[PDB]
Amino acid sequence: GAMGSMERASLIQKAKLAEQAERYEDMAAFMKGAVEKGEELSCEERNLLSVAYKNVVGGQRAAWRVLSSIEQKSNEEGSEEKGPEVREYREKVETELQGVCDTVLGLLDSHLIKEAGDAESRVFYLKMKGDYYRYLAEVATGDDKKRIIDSARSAYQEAMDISKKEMPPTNPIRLGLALNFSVFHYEIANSPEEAISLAKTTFDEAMADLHTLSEDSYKDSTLIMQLLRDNLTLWT
């Protein structure tokens, strides 16, 4: 790997520089190099890994949606034929997005998840696994769509089971997991009622636990709670 000769601490330092410079592809390459050193990641380092790849795949998802929309319009009645180029280029972006998702899933499988024993690491990684299968599901159309969806569901479900047993209902990881599993239900799994029920129960159980929190923890939790509320407003 191109980062094999760089010190772990230098990779982490440069990932933070890349974040400041909004160089998310570099950030992701640095964090991949850090993961491949073989040591477990700290909380901050897990956040860096996620920030880096979320921004990379975010740009790809946004581009994919633009191109897919153009492609679908080209397939309407009365649309002039323009050749294979829209499909080809959508496929190019799609393949690169799938590559990034596969890279993240590979890091999680070799060997972040199997070494993660604490709830805060294990839930974070299983949520990521669900997320990157969800991003794969957004573009899936063939014989493996169902299996990709079930892989996302399975990872989210294992994360949910641990988070409910081991974390308070205000924990931001637990909240962000529930938020994302609810998005999965609504947007991927054709289960809007499950999405709404999960968002509401998650919000209400967190509300009831806010009284236990410091001012700073209250701010962290309410930020994610507001996203649940925003989704419920969109969906109801």
Binding site: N47, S50, E120, P172, N180, D220, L223, I224
Partner: peptide, 9 residues
């Protein structure tokens, strides 16, 4: 819909 921020607990 909104999904979680990357950086989280």
């Amino acid at each position: 819909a909104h999904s979680s921020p990357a950086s989280x607990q």
